Amino acid sequence: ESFLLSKVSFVIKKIRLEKGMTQEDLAYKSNLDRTYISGIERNSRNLTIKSLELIMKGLEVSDVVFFEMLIKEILKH
């Protein structure tokens, strides 16, 4: 659909694997459906900031460092 989204979902998946988490853990750890997390990662979802926040607490990562990785992903080529 949209630029920022595909970047957001790329970063969530990048962190998650970096931390050796499976989708499963992530979903409990961050209080969303197992399906929701999957659906984000197939970039098929446009999440709310509140949800983003919950995912960030899920990845055990600070808002700051998350956005620092966003920025970097946006910049690749």
Of 16, 57, 51, 56, the residue nearest 32 (C-alpha): 51
- Sorted by sequence, the CB contacts under 8 Å of residue 7 that are 6+ apart come out as 70, 73, 74
Compare residues 28 and 67 and give the one whose CB is closer to DNA. Answer: 28
Tally of CB atoms within 10 A around 45:
16
Binding mask 45-74 for DNA (x = CB under 7 A): xxxx-xx--x--------------------
Using CB under 8 A, list all residues that contact a second copy: 1-5, 7-8, 46-50, 52-53, 63-64, 67-68, 70-71, 74-75
Using CB under 7 A, list all residues that contact DNA: 17, 22-25, 31-36, 38-39, 41-42, 44-48, 50-51, 54
